[PDB]
Symmetry: C4
């Protein structure tokens, strides 16, 4: 048998005292008042005493919203401490007003009434608390190293982190940003960015800072949603302290704000500037118009170069026409690169007619990249992540040009390629040119963003490449390990190239040999084993060492089982799990990326596609009025949605029970 007792004993209540608390619970005003006036005389019943479940009489009256017993206890001067916070968390405006008019606690000591109101996100109570001059202390920097922060971290790191988290949850309140903020949209933007940075820094408290940042982004989105006219939309988007607030939203990565339908509609009607009725057109006439503009890019470009002030000169300044001209010029560049592959023994030859055409687009690409560098700056250049491969293309083109010039100057004769040197400058130049050709032709992935049916697909690829990168570390570790083992076994039986039937050594021969003789060749062989191009007899030696053969063969088999059966199917399962997490927000992310692509063409800089590129208090007052109407509409909408969602608990049933019982004792008293 197990004895049961109370190992942590407390102070029990007496019979009359339990009767008093029970009368408070059922709401008998006559009995409670009689007990109070009897206690004032006899000092028998403690009015500030506790209950078995953690509450006192004022707490019971507050949770049961019985304002009349609550004010009776206030008039009898019961203990008051933390009951204000209890009324704040209870969301009872009458209790809040009465306690403003005048041990164990389930609240942290930092909990201030404004902060608990900001947690409860109740606009009424937050505004009544803000009516009095009440202050929230400022959080320090994200990476602050001052003496106060290091002392608070050293003394009690749990209370420091809880205090910072408590401050930021107070500040991220949608009601507390709707009031007491000169610019709620910009405040929500900066607060969301800061909460994202604190989510990145504080690893353990990551999810709560993530959800606070998401709450701020949702608040900004709904505030934009409450607009009701195109002027108000453009006052919001064009406020600066054009499209300044939109550029700020793009800078702070507010994809929910950017992907608003009204903002996307305004961006679309700015994008289709020259064509007012592109929204309602057929597929065939859209394709015909696109090809018609795309076949006239040199005419429009030379029109801009000659006279910007004409029906054709400023026609390319429209964003869609500029995008079509850039795409058409780049596609003609790729067509010429395809034509370039269509005497070959000259050492360091002069450039042909096709390369003589290619050279100005190469110079224009380099000039455009360095012009974007010099104009935008550094962080904006490195943030794009396409400029890395753009730099790779420019570097490979420059290397090809330099090697071609070096070969043309240094060599003159016509020697057949069969006896050329292996590190010949012409060979190096042509290899670099082919690599740059591939990089140029995969640069077209960036144009899938502007299409409706390919943009989310590109977003899904960009989100699953991260998991491919995660898997590549494990696969390369396994590859290095098995390459090391197979080298350590097989590098005694290395054979010269002369002993081979056709003077070829390596896995690229007709008869594959020496697949595990050197570390480079072992890495190549175990890489090509994934696609099945490495035959089985590469695990063979001329000597009769059958045990050596069997250990090498089972090493190869273990590598194949780990890679193709385990790791590849692991990669399939990982990307399949990752795709479902992206399919929900793919539309929003695609709309954000397409907005960035659209705003990339709104500038006057970079207008000419290559190779042609080498040849004020009223605004504040109107914005304040629009935001004031927006805040009123948003508070009304979130009040309506609070009165439309579920919201109901057993609090409501015990509230109705309390009202019925208080009335019951009232009419039993009056009758």
């Amino acid at each position: 048998r197990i004895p049961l007792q109370i190992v942590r004993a407390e102070t029990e209540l007496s019979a009359e005292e339990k009767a008093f608390l029970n009368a408070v619970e059922k709401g008998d005003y006559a009995t409670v008042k009689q007990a109070l006036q009897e206690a004032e005389i006899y000092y028998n019943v403690n009015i500030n005493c506790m209950d078995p479940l953690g509450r006192s009489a004022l707490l019971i009256a507050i949770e049961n919203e019985n304002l009349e017993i609550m004010e009776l206890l206030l008039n009898h001067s019961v203990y008051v401490g933390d009951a204000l916070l209890y009324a704040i968390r209870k969301e009872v405006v009458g209790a809040v007003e009465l306690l403003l008019s005048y041990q164990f606690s389930e609240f942290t000591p930092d909990i201030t009434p404004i902060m608990l109101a900001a947690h409860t996100n109740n606009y009424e109570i937050i505004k009544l608390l803000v009516q009095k001059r009440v202050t929230i202390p400022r959080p320090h920097q994200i990476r602050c190293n001052c003496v106060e922060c290091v002392s608070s971290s050293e003394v009690d790191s749990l209370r420091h982190s809880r205090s910072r988290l408590n401050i930021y949850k107070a500040l991220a309140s949608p009601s507390l940003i709707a009031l007491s903020s000169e610019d709620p949209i910009l405040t929500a933007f900066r607060l969301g960015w800061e909460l994202k940075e604190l989510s990145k820094v504080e690893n353990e408290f990551k999810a709560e800072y993530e959800e606070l940042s998401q709450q701020c982004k949702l608040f900004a989105k709904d505030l934009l949603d409450q607009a009701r006219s195109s002027r108000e939309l453009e006052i919001i988007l064009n406020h600066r302290d054009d499209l300044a607030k939109l550029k700020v939203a793009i800078k702070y990565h507010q994809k929910e704000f950017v992907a608003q339908p009204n903002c996307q509609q305004l961006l679309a009607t700015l994008w289709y500037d020259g064509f007012p009725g592109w929204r309602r057109k057929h597929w065939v006439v859209k394709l015909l118009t696109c090809m018609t503009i795309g076949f006239l890019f040199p005419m429009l470009s030379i029109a801009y170069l000659i006279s910007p002030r004409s029906n054709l000169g400023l026609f390319i300044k429209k964003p869609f026409i500029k995008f079509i001209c850039h795409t058409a010029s780049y596609l003609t560049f790729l067509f010429m690169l395809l034509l370039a592959s269509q005497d070959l023994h000259v050492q360091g030859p002069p450039p042909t007619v096709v390369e003589w055409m290619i050279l100005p687009w190469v110079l224009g690409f380099i000039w455009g990249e360095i012009k974007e560098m010099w104009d935008g700056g550094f962080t904006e250049y490195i943030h794009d992540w396409w400029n890395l491969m753009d730099f790779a293309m420019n570097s490979l083109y420059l290397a090809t040009i330099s090697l071609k010039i070096v070969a043309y100057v240094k060599y003159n004769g016509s020697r057949p390629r069969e006896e050329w040197e292996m590190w010949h400058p012409t060979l190096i130049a042509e290899a670099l040119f082919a690599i740059s050709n591939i990089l140029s032709s995969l640069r077209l992935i960036s144009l899938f963003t502007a299409n409706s049916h390919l943009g989310p697909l590109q977003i899904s690829l960009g989100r699953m490449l991260l998991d491919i990168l995660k898997f590549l570390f494990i696969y390369c570790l396994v590859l290095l390990a098995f390459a090391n083992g197979l080298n350590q076994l097989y590098f005694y039986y290395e054979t010269r190239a002369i002993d081979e039937p056709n003077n070829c050594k390596g896995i690229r021969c007709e008869k594959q040999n020496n697949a595990f003789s050197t570390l480079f060749e072992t890495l190549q062989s175990l890489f090509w084993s994934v696609f099945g191009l490495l035959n089985l007899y590469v695990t063979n030696v001329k000597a009769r060492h059958e045990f050596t053969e069997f250990v090498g063969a089972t090493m190869f088999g273990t590598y194949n089982v780990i890679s193709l059966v385990v790791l590849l199917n692991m990669l399939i399962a990982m990307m399949n799990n990752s795709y479902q997490l992206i399919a929900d927000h793919a539309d929003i992310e695609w709309k954000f990326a397409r907005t960035k692509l659209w705003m990339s063409y709104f500038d006057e800089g970079g207008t000419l596609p290559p190779p042609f590129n080498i040849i004020s208090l009223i605004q504040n007052q109107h914005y304040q009025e629009v935001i004031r109407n927006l805040v009123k509409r948003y508070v009304a909408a979130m009040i309506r949605n609070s009165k439309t969602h579920e919201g109901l608990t057993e609090e409501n049933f015990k509230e109705l029970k309390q009202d019925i019982s208080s009335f019951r004792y009232e009419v039993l008293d009056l009758l």
Copy 2:
């Protein structure tokens, strides 16, 4: 006949789904309080 049956069916299904919010609790609270001030007035 189909429209009469459909209106009856969707009324029944409106009276069979969840449909309830804190509007209903404050409605009952309002009825109880209005009655309360009524009988405090009559008595």
Copy 3:
């Protein structure tokens, strides 16, 4: 502008008449009674009139559960029709009792009060209706062809199907089976089986019959769940009209009833008859005991053959020991089959020592199969779906024996196999023996059911083989189509075997040839193209018909794209979707299959593993008492669970509003 009107106009109510219905809605008894006694005199207000929303005064009183206005209207003799059914659907026992004591309708004409009560599944109302002698008409056979059924199908097939569905939904009520049934468990079993058959037949009304069958199975499971002692469990399982009801449940495929924890515990303690403490033992001692019993199967078998009445004779009659002995004998048979592969030029040789051992297990397997046939019967034999491959094994073994005997009798000499005939009886016999070896060795999949970690895996394979079978039709259609096309192109360039370098024709040669010359070889080639074993140069001819080559190559490429890229990934996606639908019920299905495997060993027949197999109203009364206690417990449990689930709608809020308003007009009247 669109005009709006009432295209289907109805009869509006007058002002006093709307006032009367509004007074009924708010529950003013004084106003309603005054209006009734005024209408009795003046004939100005129609008491049976309709409202804008389809109801009358009695309907409003019934839906608002206001029994006092409802009985007032009953005393004033308002229209009564279908208000009883309205009270049945409303689940108000007072309204039901009062209407029992005494146009447009949203109910079908077949709706009878007992049937609507059975739909509502309210035990109280169903019992009050059953107190009066009330009858439900019998549904006919599933495939009945009588004149009444064919006439009802021809006259109005919608009303016939709705009537049958209405009858079966009435009969499948858990409360209506808990009452008025001599055997609720057997009634639920037969009703679930019949509803499954009607689900199979009625294709359009499939889901509702499926959910009714599932409801009956759940009712039977919960009725078994309400047992509270091992005697009651065994009275339920051992009732017959041993384990007769359990065998009936297995026959009717009640997997939920079979997979009950108490039933599985009783089956386990019958299964581990000889070992009382196998439940609490270590893995190593379990493995040691299993190998110890498995290495002694001939000793236990010969002990049973010599003397069944001993410590060793009846030791094999225990189910676990019998299962271990069968498994050990069959594993030794497979070990001998492995040994059989370890002079070869004799035409029709005598059987060797290993085959002379194999022959009695072959005879024992055939004898056991025909004995199971003769004992169990026909439907039980063909239902197992393992007996098909068992028959295949027996037929191949018999064919091997017959061909070996024919070869031994007909041939005597010793000719080397290089010049044997291609259809030689020895060659045919050895091919059939190898095929039977594979079938014998994959017969071990059936033993994965008895294991804890492999049984659900076998269930998942058995459920995804259906989708593989579904996909195989499409793949074989594509295979036949592309084989036909490639034959029609390539069968002009068929070359003889002599013209080949090594006198070999077909895709099984060193140099693959003639892959699309005949239909059989084209089917083989396009089958082997799936696994990559068919090289690319099989699409080549000796002549210089390059267009012919290109069309053949692009046909091969289109087939590879359809098969490996589209169809194989389709199969992967289909099985991945199918696995998630099986992972939920895999435990229940595995427990059912393991119960079937356990009951297969409970019989005295088939005790000896091969080759050794060729060498009473008190029961009804106790069952009735146990079922009566079970029904009382189940009704109490489902009443408690009805008072524990959500169950609440705006019906409850308008009920409380009606009570408050009726009281309000009452006290305004009394004061």
Copy 4:
């Protein structure tokens, strides 16, 4: 385990290796069965190593031979058939026993269909189902494993890395 972005990935591998181990029993049973059948058919036509063009016997030669002559070599051949490194003409004999050839070839085809088409896609579906059950608690399991790794270094014993500990 000590890394933020690789620890849950290692946990996911450690949880899907159990399902790979579950599948390996069925695959090895099928492998043993088809190896037994192909041995029982093909072990009459075993050829010596001397008769071969380059005195090599087995599936590791230039010309693959005797893939189903012994049980060890049949197990090796039907293992290497999974990755496609076993050519089709290993189901060939010098004699003109075309029925023997056809039965051996359809045995090889049935094994390939069971393994690559059915069983491998079964393994893919099984690990894909198993990964979703682990993705929810991967963070908690990784934090537990990293806590164990951290507490492994809190002791004074085992302070010196090798070879300084001797």
